[PDB]
Amino acid sequence: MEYHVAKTGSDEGKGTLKDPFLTINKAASVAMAGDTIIVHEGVYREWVKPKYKGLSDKRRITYKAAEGEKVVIKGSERIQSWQRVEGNVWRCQLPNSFFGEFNPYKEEVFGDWLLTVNEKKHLGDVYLNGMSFYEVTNYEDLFNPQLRTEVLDHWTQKIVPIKNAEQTKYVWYAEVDREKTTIYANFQGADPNEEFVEINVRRSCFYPVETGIDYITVKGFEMAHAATPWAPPTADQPGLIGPNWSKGWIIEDNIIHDAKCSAISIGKEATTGNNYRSIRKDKPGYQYQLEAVFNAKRNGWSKEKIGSHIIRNNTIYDCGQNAIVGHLGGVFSEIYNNHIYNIALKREFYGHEIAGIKLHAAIDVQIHHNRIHDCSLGLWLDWEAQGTRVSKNLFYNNNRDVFVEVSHGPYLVDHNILSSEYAIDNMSQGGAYINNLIAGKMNQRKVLNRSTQYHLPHSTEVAGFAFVYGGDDRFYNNIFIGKEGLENVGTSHYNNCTTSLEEYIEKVNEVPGDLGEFERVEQPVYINKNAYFNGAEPFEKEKDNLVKKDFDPKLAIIDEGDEVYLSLQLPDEFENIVGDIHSTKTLERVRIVDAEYESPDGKELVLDTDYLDAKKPENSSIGPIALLKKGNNYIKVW
Amino acid sequence: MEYHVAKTGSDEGKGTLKDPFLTINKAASVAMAGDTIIVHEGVYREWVKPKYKGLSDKRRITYKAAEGEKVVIKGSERIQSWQRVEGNVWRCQLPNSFFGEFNPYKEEVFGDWLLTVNEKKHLGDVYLNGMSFYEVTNYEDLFNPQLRTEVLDHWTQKIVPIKNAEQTKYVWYAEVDREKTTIYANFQGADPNEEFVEINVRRSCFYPVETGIDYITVKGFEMAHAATPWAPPTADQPGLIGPNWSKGWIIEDNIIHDAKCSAISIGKEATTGNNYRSIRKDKPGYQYQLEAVFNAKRNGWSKEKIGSHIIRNNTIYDCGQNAIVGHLGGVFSEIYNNHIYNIALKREFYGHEIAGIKLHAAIDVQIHHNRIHDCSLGLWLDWEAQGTRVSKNLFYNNNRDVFVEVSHGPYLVDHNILSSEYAIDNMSQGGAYINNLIAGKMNQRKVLNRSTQYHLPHSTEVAGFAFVYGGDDRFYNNIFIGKEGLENVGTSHYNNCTTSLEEYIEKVNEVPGDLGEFERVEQPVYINKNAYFNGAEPFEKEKDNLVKKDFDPKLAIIDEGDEVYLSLQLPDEFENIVGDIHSTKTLERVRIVDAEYESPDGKELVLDTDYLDAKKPENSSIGPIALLKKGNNYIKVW
Amino acid sequence: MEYHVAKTGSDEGKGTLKDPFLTINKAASVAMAGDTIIVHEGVYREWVKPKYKGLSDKRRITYKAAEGEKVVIKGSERIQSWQRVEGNVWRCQLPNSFFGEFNPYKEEVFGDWLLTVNEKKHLGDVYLNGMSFYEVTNYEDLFNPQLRTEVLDHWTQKIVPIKNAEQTKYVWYAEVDREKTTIYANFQGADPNEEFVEINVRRSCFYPVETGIDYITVKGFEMAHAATPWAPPTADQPGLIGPNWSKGWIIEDNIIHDAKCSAISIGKEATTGNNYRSIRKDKPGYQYQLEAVFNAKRNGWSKEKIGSHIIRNNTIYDCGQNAIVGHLGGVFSEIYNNHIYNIALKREFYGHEIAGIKLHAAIDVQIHHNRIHDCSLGLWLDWEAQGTRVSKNLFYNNNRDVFVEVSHGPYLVDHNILSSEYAIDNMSQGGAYINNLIAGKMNQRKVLNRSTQYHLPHSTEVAGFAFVYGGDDRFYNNIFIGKEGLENVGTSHYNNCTTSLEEYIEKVNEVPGDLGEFERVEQPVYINKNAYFNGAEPFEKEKDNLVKKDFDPKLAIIDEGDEVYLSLQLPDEFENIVGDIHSTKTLERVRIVDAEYESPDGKELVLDTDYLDAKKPENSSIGPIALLKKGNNYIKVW
Ligand SMILES: O[C@@H]1[C@@H](O)[C@H](O[C@@H]2CO[C@@H](O)[C@H](O)[C@H]2O)OC[C@H]1O
Ligand SMILES: O[C@@H]1[C@@H](O)[C@H](O[C@@H]2CO[C@@H](O)[C@H](O)[C@H]2O)OC[C@H]1O
Ligand SMILES: O[C@@H]1[C@@H](O)[C@H](O[C@@H]2CO[C@@H](O)[C@H](O)[C@H]2O)OC[C@H]1O
């Protein structure tokens, strides 16, 4: 059946093209495996809840915007009952029933690993012609808000400019009592009943209320204004839109924005763990998280029931925690051709779950051809990044590009452009960095007080757990570019490491013993054919590399809106260093996990196409793009 | 922490004895492992939703009535806005908002195995001073309702007396449109605003809205009027009160009544299957049910996470489907000392899920010392009755007492009084009927077109599945009593069976082959030391028995309210037949499941105590009570 | 490390090219992950037992014949100590110690589903210059054996010519006592000490004695003379060569022959079940088999640990039970480009486990491009043929080509040439027969007294179990060819079936009920675009077909040794039927299992290449080869 929803329809109608329903949730309550829901032009202020599941990729349930029509789903409501209090501060009042069981003005940003704990923030929000406001703590703070032009990035501890300084003068504050909710905001001179003013109301826009609602496709909608809660790996992880613990979703061609915390969630649900550290306080989140993994396994977490989602061609921005989030629920998924930006820039709250994309247990996840910029952290892989592949992505203007934490691999980062000043946070082992352009520092550190799971290949089955001893990384064909006043760009971080698994084994086995003997020897690194310009430093034992510390490539990423260009100068010597095609055959297996770098299907992986998808010969330029050559280079990269 | 709830309290209070909360759900939203909630006298019209789980039997969360106080939880509301329409018919009207998302007047009795499909019934109800009404189909049926005094028992096809004929004149009917719910009822002359008139409103009284809320004890409440839905093994199975897919609850000392369908549910939740036959219509519930078993297994169904509930010392009556119901969620549970009666007597709807107690997959469930009467069916064990023990129960005045269907055992039925005319529906194999008084017929039938699971011992692990070939039953020390014209009382049903596993094996292996050779031989039966009176007939190959077809025991169960007596005459020959103490050692293992009759803990089981819990010697009177002797017997049995 | 084994070697040697080992088992006791064992020219009389496992597809352990060298592994020994008894009968005697724990002359062909129980046969064998003998039951039968030229095919009950009639005069008989093994045989005039005479000695040739020895490649050997035991699905299933319950073997380019029972085994091991029906006799093999599936599941039977083997480019012939056999151990494997013939033609023993290839639980197994002829039965898929694809194979001169038993699909049989007179035994549902040439009858039957497992897609997880109700099959683009006096060729078998899942559901849901209602409606069949010649008959409701009862295609398969040709005449109308390219989108899902016809990786399957591997046009003619045309066709098919 092909159901139709239109602003001229009726939920008492048949749901056909000639007699369409009025609300999307109406169609969602009757559609079944194989059906399509076509939604016509209009703004739908409702939380859509798919009731029945698709039964296979062929028999999915498809929700999409009519061809050529602008369809918006919002979790907000326009408010036109504001009353001026004094100066530029206005107030509106709503009976609590307006929000029902979930009141964003009563709900707090709360949970494990949330660090901003003295100044409570809530899930509500006020918007003036689309621009969200800043929450303030007291009634008094509403009247003469101070314009701010700079802010502290918590992780890097650097003061950075505020993108939209003007927005800092727009503030809101709310009070919830037993009968009603009173919301105040400073509109700086505008008449809020006259301008287009909205407030957050619902938690989500498109998210099932039951787990297991598989095979749903959601396509071509603009979705916005969702009061989503802090979403750590140890709690339920709702988002503005998400599959809610199921399999085979396809979320594509949507423009998603203004989720209080995470926009798209492919995370876990409450049953396997729900902020026990923050609520019970008897054990840390670390201990509760490794436990949630086993609880999930007992609840059927496996390729047969969970994950294999596709997130593609979406534009996601202006969210406070992530554009994409998820612990466990995203295994085997694919995330590609997305444009992600402006994530967590307002910095109203901070904690260890913020990034454009953050995934825990991203087993065999493929993250490729995405454009991620203007985020405090572009991508964060945290625990169990096994089989994960980060390939052909464009990262720029981020406070940090990539962070892979407490993982054992094998994980692969290939043909990416990582152009931010702080490019890599590496607190893992078992990685392969192949043919990337890396223009920022790398912070590499062992993790000896936290042990995390590893798995059988291409599976959620647990094989064991390990600490991160550091090393056991591969670096081939990368172009590293330092900068005056920037330390740690390159691979010199591994100077004390062995250079082959055979060497590591010979050394460990020089004297009888067990664990202690292994801990006294540094793991091996496999590093060759990298270039180091403008101050980047090489691993001391690399055999074939190109080092020109005094050469400045003058790298620039030129963002012109729908298109982005890469500008880079390369020295004549660039022509004399040639890279090999890497593959399952050329990359040494990771030690602890004892597994190869292969395709998700178990077959050999061959890294022979570059960032621009051009096939390359056995000897070609190093770096992410085969076309780069000595001299001037100006290449369209998006 | 010991929380207090009282009608003088406040939900903004501390919840202490001096500053109590007002609603039980307020305490349920903050209590944590190890806390107790003490509720003071009053009627609490709310659905209590335990929020946090107990963490062990020691650290449970206890909800209880204050010592000596009458505490009532109801799902109904008193209505005093009725307006006379005409005659004795009155009407009230409520906004749909009054019911929230669950409206009993809109929600139908619906689902797999519901047979009364031409006459739509709903989950609502109307009560006059506690007496529920009969729903009618048309507005017109309200004005001159017919008093009925007899009704057809569906399974037995016998017309029987309606217990409360007067009640048949009180009828209701309702309509729900987009805005309002309108209820009409005939009050036969009473003034509904003057009398105490209530209507169903909420689905449950005490039921978590999340699964996994373990170790909760609910004690000393009267709970009533819940609009519970039709609960087959293939759907979500909510009830008036239940653990909702969790472990270790204790439901004791409560008085529960007027659940539309099932009162106490220890069943399954929606995720493992939800009326797929009725909704998708592509495969029968039979096929969907065996699938739900494997779906649950992948969803954690095991002794470590589900079951081990205790339901004791409760009185449960006036429910339309069951006093206790549940598929999968009741494994390893114990049900004892409960008084169950008046279950499904109104017969407003009928289907194959009705009985005082009905349990699917009652693995190792212990059902003992219960008083069950005035039910269309007392107990129904349907599928996987493995390790189940029905012992020392008192069944009387039921259209049928016990039904064990498509199970392979080993299941044990010992020391019971099955006094109804139709005592047993036996559509299984692997049973042991030891020391019972059986005074009604047995209908024994093979089931060759349905195969069902069997398990490893004391576990939910699946070992295989099988059809019911019939036989492979044990009958020792039972007293059978027929009645004029009543056929099939006794054990002659098995006349063609083999008499030992050795004989079955020898006959099967006479000619080479496989399945076909096994199917041509009847399974063995182990029958000895039974007495047959007043028409009961024995297995023709039984070696030691007492048959006195002409002797009438003049059996009578005298129910005097809180006490019940058994009146029974026995012949002088009764003294010459003596029974052995049966045990794991004396009961032959079941053939297909290949398991012994033992205790839930895997230890030897010895059946040396009778119905009155008196220890008995090796040679003792047969039947359920050792005190029974030749002559007159008048014994208190409750 | 590359180890070398040569007849000039020594097992005290280093095992290098210059200082090679002498036996292959010596290399097998020291080789580790990533090593290669190169065996040089010669005959190695030993059972090779791989000791250490390969660790991945990249780090396997490879055993292969040196390039261009003839390497033979045999389980036999040459005997030259024969003494003439009388006439042409000779005798040899050996110490029992010569056979060790396994004596072929003592061991019997024994076990579940073995039907020849009067005539005890043993696992030994005698060969004269490579030609095996027939065992006789009594000493006296040795002296004047009668030449036999015809024999009864047990299944078809037709008397057929004996291929090698002369071989019927060579017989052997043996006795084993406390000390010695004495073997007698009639050499019909030859001198066994002068000729090359061998006897079976060892059970296997290349088989680990431990399970889990994964990732082994065996290439380029000739292997022969193994005293392998009867291998039903309910027992241990050893073979001449096999992985013995592990994952990722590659058995290729070998010539394998004279395995007493099965040659290559990808079956199960003893712990999950071992002839309990035959040994305990309390339950049938059917019951013990369904149990073995669950026992294996608890023993880790899953894609992560078992299966994914590849058997390609081998020639396997002269085996008494199968060329390839296996229950459970072969999941997800691929079998292709093998030449299989002369399987079970001596008929010294018979039972329900015989076929060129027999697999139980062939989940997602791909069987393609195989040439299978001169077998009593070409291929037998028995239980759990889910996701199995039988494609582009050449079947001729077999008493029966294919048998798919008690499976529920989705299973695919496409682009095959099934040229024998008895082409298909179909005792399943859920099949799709696409673009085949089928020249023999089909026997299709329901199986209502045996229920068997089905699974989640692409997994060993159990989803349910079911009887075979019949139907729910698809037949598109097949060319059926009848023959005078041959009945049941075509698709008329399905005449009472519904024609769409919609029709089935509508009819079942005409009257309320459950299983009984579903049982009275015949499952749907999807049949169109088939041709029926020379007496083949169509499904009465097929909409687009070509029926020419009087047209005789005079099909003939001309076997010229290494090349095989197809000769076929087609009518002028042949090109009027235009076939569609089938795929996941065009094949209706199977009903009970509720799954689509997909690729093993879970993606869309498109059948767009023909038997000759030519890309097929959208508007193609039917049958297995797109180039078939009206008139004469003479095509090389091997
Ligand atoms: O379990 C995840 C953690 O691995 C991660 O937190 C890291 C360790 O704790 C902090 O002190 C570190 O700075 C941070 O990188 O995120 C929290 C949780 O998702
Ligand atoms: O699956 C359960 C059934 O075993 C049971 O239904 C039985 C079989 O169908 C009816 O024809 C029989 O009369 C009934 O006893 O209940 C339905 C379901 O819970
Ligand atoms: O379990 C497998 C059987 O399905 C199969 O036996 C079939 C059923 O019994 C016989 O009467 C049939 O002819 C045969 O096809 O093989 C035995 C076992 O492998």
PDB file of N, CA, C and O in Angstrom, chain C residues 241-269:
ATOM      1  N   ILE C 241      39.277 -37.683   3.781  1.00  0.00           N
ATOM      2  CA  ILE C 241      39.861 -36.371   4.040  1.00  0.00           C
ATOM      3  C   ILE C 241      38.731 -35.468   4.552  1.00  0.00           C
ATOM      4  O   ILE C 241      37.583 -35.612   4.116  1.00  0.00           O
ATOM      5  N   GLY C 242      39.049 -34.543   5.461  1.00  0.00           N
ATOM      6  CA  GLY C 242      38.021 -33.652   5.990  1.00  0.00           C
ATOM      7  C   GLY C 242      38.555 -32.752   7.082  1.00  0.00           C
ATOM      8  O   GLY C 242      39.568 -33.078   7.691  1.00  0.00           O
ATOM      9  N   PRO C 243      37.877 -31.619   7.379  1.00  0.00           N
ATOM     10  CA  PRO C 243      38.312 -30.665   8.405  1.00  0.00           C
ATOM     11  C   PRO C 243      38.044 -31.087   9.835  1.00  0.00           C
ATOM     12  O   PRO C 243      38.573 -30.468  10.763  1.00  0.00           O
ATOM     13  N   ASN C 244      37.222 -32.122  10.011  1.00  0.00           N
ATOM     14  CA  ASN C 244      36.857 -32.588  11.348  1.00  0.00           C
ATOM     15  C   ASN C 244      36.396 -31.434  12.248  1.00  0.00           C
ATOM     16  O   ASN C 244      37.088 -31.076  13.218  1.00  0.00           O
ATOM     17  N   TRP C 245      35.247 -30.833  11.909  1.00  0.00           N
ATOM     18  CA  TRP C 245      34.638 -29.808  12.775  1.00  0.00           C
ATOM     19  C   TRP C 245      35.516 -28.585  12.982  1.00  0.00           C
ATOM     20  O   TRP C 245      35.959 -28.317  14.095  1.00  0.00           O
ATOM     21  N   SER C 246      35.792 -27.855  11.903  1.00  0.00           N
ATOM     22  CA  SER C 246      36.616 -26.652  11.990  1.00  0.00           C
ATOM     23  C   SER C 246      36.138 -25.690  10.904  1.00  0.00           C
ATOM     24  O   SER C 246      35.065 -25.886  10.306  1.00  0.00           O
ATOM     25  N   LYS C 247      36.951 -24.677  10.625  1.00  0.00           N
ATOM     26  CA  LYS C 247      36.568 -23.680   9.639  1.00  0.00           C
ATOM     27  C   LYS C 247      37.671 -23.283   8.630  1.00  0.00           C
ATOM     28  O   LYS C 247      38.863 -23.250   8.960  1.00  0.00           O
ATOM     29  N   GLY C 248      37.231 -22.946   7.425  1.00  0.00           N
ATOM     30  CA  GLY C 248      38.109 -22.434   6.396  1.00  0.00           C
ATOM     31  C   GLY C 248      39.085 -23.295   5.635  1.00  0.00           C
ATOM     32  O   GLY C 248      40.130 -22.791   5.209  1.00  0.00           O
ATOM     33  N   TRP C 249      38.768 -24.567   5.445  1.00  0.00           N
ATOM     34  CA  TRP C 249      39.677 -25.418   4.686  1.00  0.00           C
ATOM     35  C   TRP C 249      39.492 -25.167   3.198  1.00  0.00           C
ATOM     36  O   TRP C 249      38.442 -24.671   2.765  1.00  0.00           O
ATOM     37  N   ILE C 250      40.532 -25.464   2.427  1.00  0.00           N
ATOM     38  CA  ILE C 250      40.447 -25.373   0.991  1.00  0.00           C
ATOM     39  C   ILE C 250      40.984 -26.722   0.474  1.00  0.00           C
ATOM     40  O   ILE C 250      42.176 -27.029   0.600  1.00  0.00           O
ATOM     41  N   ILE C 251      40.089 -27.552  -0.056  1.00  0.00           N
ATOM     42  CA  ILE C 251      40.500 -28.851  -0.593  1.00  0.00           C
ATOM     43  C   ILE C 251      40.384 -28.717  -2.123  1.00  0.00           C
ATOM     44  O   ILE C 251      39.276 -28.677  -2.676  1.00  0.00           O
ATOM     45  N   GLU C 252      41.521 -28.679  -2.809  1.00  0.00           N
ATOM     46  CA  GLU C 252      41.470 -28.413  -4.249  1.00  0.00           C
ATOM     47  C   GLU C 252      42.481 -29.210  -5.103  1.00  0.00           C
ATOM     48  O   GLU C 252      43.523 -29.610  -4.616  1.00  0.00           O
ATOM     49  N   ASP C 253      42.153 -29.386  -6.382  1.00  0.00           N
ATOM     50  CA  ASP C 253      43.004 -30.070  -7.374  1.00  0.00           C
ATOM     51  C   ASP C 253      43.489 -31.452  -6.956  1.00  0.00           C
ATOM     52  O   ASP C 253      44.611 -31.853  -7.275  1.00  0.00           O
ATOM     53  N   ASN C 254      42.653 -32.181  -6.230  1.00  0.00           N
ATOM     54  CA  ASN C 254      43.029 -33.528  -5.815  1.00  0.00           C
ATOM     55  C   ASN C 254      42.248 -34.558  -6.596  1.00  0.00           C
ATOM     56  O   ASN C 254      41.176 -34.262  -7.119  1.00  0.00           O
ATOM     57  N   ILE C 255      42.799 -35.768  -6.649  1.00  0.00           N
ATOM     58  CA  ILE C 255      42.128 -36.881  -7.273  1.00  0.00           C
ATOM     59  C   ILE C 255      41.895 -37.828  -6.086  1.00  0.00           C
ATOM     60  O   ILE C 255      42.849 -38.342  -5.497  1.00  0.00           O
ATOM     61  N   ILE C 256      40.630 -38.065  -5.749  1.00  0.00           N
ATOM     62  CA  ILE C 256      40.259 -38.875  -4.617  1.00  0.00           C
ATOM     63  C   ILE C 256      39.396 -40.068  -4.993  1.00  0.00           C
ATOM     64  O   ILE C 256      38.369 -39.925  -5.672  1.00  0.00           O
ATOM     65  N   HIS C 257      39.790 -41.260  -4.553  1.00  0.00           N
ATOM     66  CA  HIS C 257      38.966 -42.395  -4.886  1.00  0.00           C
ATOM     67  C   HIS C 257      39.095 -43.554  -3.929  1.00  0.00           C
ATOM     68  O   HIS C 257      39.980 -43.583  -3.073  1.00  0.00           O
ATOM     69  N   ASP C 258      38.196 -44.521  -4.092  1.00  0.00           N
ATOM     70  CA  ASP C 258      38.145 -45.707  -3.246  1.00  0.00           C
ATOM     71  C   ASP C 258      38.070 -45.471  -1.744  1.00  0.00           C
ATOM     72  O   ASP C 258      38.850 -46.015  -0.976  1.00  0.00           O
ATOM     73  N   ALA C 259      37.119 -44.638  -1.335  1.00  0.00           N
ATOM     74  CA  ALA C 259      36.846 -44.438   0.090  1.00  0.00           C
ATOM     75  C   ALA C 259      35.760 -45.503   0.308  1.00  0.00           C
ATOM     76  O   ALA C 259      34.807 -45.584  -0.492  1.00  0.00           O
ATOM     77  N   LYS C 260      35.879 -46.321   1.354  1.00  0.00           N
ATOM     78  CA  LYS C 260      34.853 -47.340   1.589  1.00  0.00           C
ATOM     79  C   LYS C 260      33.444 -46.737   1.583  1.00  0.00           C
ATOM     80  O   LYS C 260      32.529 -47.209   0.872  1.00  0.00           O
ATOM     81  N   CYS C 261      33.261 -45.703   2.400  1.00  0.00           N
ATOM     82  CA  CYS C 261      31.979 -45.030   2.471  1.00  0.00           C
ATOM     83  C   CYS C 261      32.132 -43.630   1.886  1.00  0.00           C
ATOM     84  O   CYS C 261      32.075 -43.483   0.646  1.00  0.00           O
ATOM     85  N   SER C 262      32.369 -42.610   2.716  1.00  0.00           N
ATOM     86  CA  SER C 262      32.488 -41.263   2.147  1.00  0.00           C
ATOM     87  C   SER C 262      33.931 -40.812   1.974  1.00  0.00           C
ATOM     88  O   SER C 262      34.780 -41.139   2.803  1.00  0.00           O
ATOM     89  N   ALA C 263      34.193 -40.048   0.910  1.00  0.00           N
ATOM     90  CA  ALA C 263      35.524 -39.524   0.592  1.00  0.00           C
ATOM     91  C   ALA C 263      35.825 -38.247   1.358  1.00  0.00           C
ATOM     92  O   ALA C 263      36.634 -38.250   2.282  1.00  0.00           O
ATOM     93  N   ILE C 264      35.198 -37.145   0.971  1.00  0.00           N
ATOM     94  CA  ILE C 264      35.450 -35.904   1.671  1.00  0.00           C
ATOM     95  C   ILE C 264      34.308 -35.668   2.633  1.00  0.00           C
ATOM     96  O   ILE C 264      33.128 -35.689   2.236  1.00  0.00           O
ATOM     97  N   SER C 265      34.652 -35.455   3.899  1.00  0.00           N
ATOM     98  CA  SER C 265      33.627 -35.166   4.883  1.00  0.00           C
ATOM     99  C   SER C 265      33.734 -33.754   5.453  1.00  0.00           C
ATOM    100  O   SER C 265      34.793 -33.344   5.909  1.00  0.00           O
ATOM    101  N   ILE C 266      32.638 -33.002   5.400  1.00  0.00           N
ATOM    102  CA  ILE C 266      32.611 -31.709   6.043  1.00  0.00           C
ATOM    103  C   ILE C 266      31.444 -31.880   7.030  1.00  0.00           C
ATOM    104  O   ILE C 266      30.590 -31.011   7.163  1.00  0.00           O
ATOM    105  N   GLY C 267      31.429 -33.039   7.709  1.00  0.00           N
ATOM    106  CA  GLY C 267      30.369 -33.396   8.643  1.00  0.00           C
ATOM    107  C   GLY C 267      30.584 -33.064  10.115  1.00  0.00           C
ATOM    108  O   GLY C 267      31.381 -32.164  10.462  1.00  0.00           O
ATOM    109  N   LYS C 268      29.893 -33.784  10.997  1.00  0.00           N
ATOM    110  CA  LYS C 268      30.020 -33.479  12.409  1.00  0.00           C
ATOM    111  C   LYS C 268      30.884 -34.495  13.174  1.00  0.00           C
ATOM    112  O   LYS C 268      31.360 -35.480  12.594  1.00  0.00           O
ATOM    113  N   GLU C 269      31.119 -34.244  14.464  1.00  0.00           N
ATOM    114  CA  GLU C 269      31.936 -35.165  15.263  1.00  0.00           C
ATOM    115  C   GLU C 269      31.072 -35.920  16.277  1.00  0.00           C
ATOM    116  O   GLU C 269      29.888 -35.670  16.416  1.00  0.00           O
TER     117      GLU C 269
END
